C-alpha cells in the first residue's frame, strides 16, 4: 500500500508544474525504494547501505570508510556492476556489452 501511495505523491509533485513524464519512469523509482521490504531512502543511509558490490558503493558519498569495512570482512565484488567495470576499465555489461559474439566455423564453411 505504501508503494502505491508513494507513487501518487511523486506524481503530484512532478505534475504540479505542468510537466509530464511517462508512468513507467516513476514506477521503477518508486519500486526500487521498496524492494527491500521497507521505505529505503536514496540518501547516504539508504541505497548506499546495500548488499551490492563494495567497489560500486564506495563512489557514492563514502569511499574510504566503505573500503575499510570491505577489507575487514573480505567482501568480494562480482564485477557485474557498471561502475565496477568503469574503474577496472573493462566493457560494462550493458547495451552492446550485455552479450557475447562468437564465430561459427560451420556457417563460415557454408559461406563459400
Amino acid at each position: 500500500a505504501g508503494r502505491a501511495a508513494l507513487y501518487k505523491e511523486v506524481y503530484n509533485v512532478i505534475a504540479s508544474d505542468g510537466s509530464y513524464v511517462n508512468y513507467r519512469h516513476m514506477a521503477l523509482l518508486v519500486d526500487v525504494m521498496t524492494t527491500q521490504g521497507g521505505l529505503t531512502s536514496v540518501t547516504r543511509h539508504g541505497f548506499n547501505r546495500s548488499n551490492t558490490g563494495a567497489l560500486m558503493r564506495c563512489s557514492f558519498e563514502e569511499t574510504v570508510e566503505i573500503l575499510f569495512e570491505a577489507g575487514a570482512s573480505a567482501e568480494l565484488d562480482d564485477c557485474r556492476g557498471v561502475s565496477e567495470n568503469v574503474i577496472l576499465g573493462q566493457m560494462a555489461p550493458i547495451g552492446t556489452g550485455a552479450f557475447d559474439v562468437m564465430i561459427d566455423e560451420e556457417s563460415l564453411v557454408k559461406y563459400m
Binding site: 550485455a98 557475447d100 559474439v101 562468437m102 561459427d104 556457417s107 563460415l108 559461406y111
Partner: protein, 81 residues
Amino acid sequence: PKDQRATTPYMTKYERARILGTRALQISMNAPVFVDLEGETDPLRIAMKELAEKKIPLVIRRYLPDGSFEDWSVEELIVDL
C-alpha cells in the same frame, strides 16, 4: 540449450550495433569478404550490405540472469530495424 530458446527471435538494436561495428572492424583488418564489391570502400557500409544478405558468420550468445545463455545465429535472427 538450443532446444526451446526462450529469447526473442528478433535482433535487438544493440546486437545490430555491435555486429555492424564488429564485422566492420574485421573487414578493415582485411578479413575475407563474402559479398561482391560495388565500389563500396567504407568498411561499415559493407557490413550493412553483408547484414542485409545474411552473410555475417557470427552467433550471438545472450546471457540470462542466472549465468546461462542461448546461442542465436545471425542467419536465424530477424532483422526488422
